[PDB]
Design a protein around this nucleic acid. Sequence first.
DNA 1: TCTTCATCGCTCAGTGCT
DNA 2: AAGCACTGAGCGATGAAG
Lengths: 62, 62
Amino acid sequence: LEIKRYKNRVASRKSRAKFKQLLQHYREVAAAKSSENDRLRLLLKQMCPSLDVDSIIPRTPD
Amino acid sequence: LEIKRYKNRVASRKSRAKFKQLLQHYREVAAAKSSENDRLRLLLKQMCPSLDVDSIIPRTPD
DNA sequence: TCTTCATCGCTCAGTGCT
DNA sequence: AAGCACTGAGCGATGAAG
């Protein structure tokens, strides 16, 4: 019946790792998009300085 | 003692809730910025159709 | 009714901070 | 030094899928 415990242990390890990695994934996505967002906003202001950038599209945290 | 167990049980609950809440937070942030990213990219194409899309800022998936 | 396994709550044994 | 909040992880109970 020790096998039942080892199988049980492995599953737990996988589940916890899956959640931790999912956490990092949304972090990596948010970081990458945030970088673009900053890159895009400036380039938009450069081409069309008269347009209000933060007025039409609010800057979302973080 | 029972006291040691009860405090740690509450702490464990708080800890699991903290991570779950952290995940939702990073999800909500990732979604919002992705939304902003799309909102920005579109407004860019409308104002300057001549500009090359994905060239200056590569469009990451998700 | 009985496996199989993903999730998770309880517990132990630390870890880090002060 | 030593109490405190916090958490990694083994364990067992539960849920969900076959």
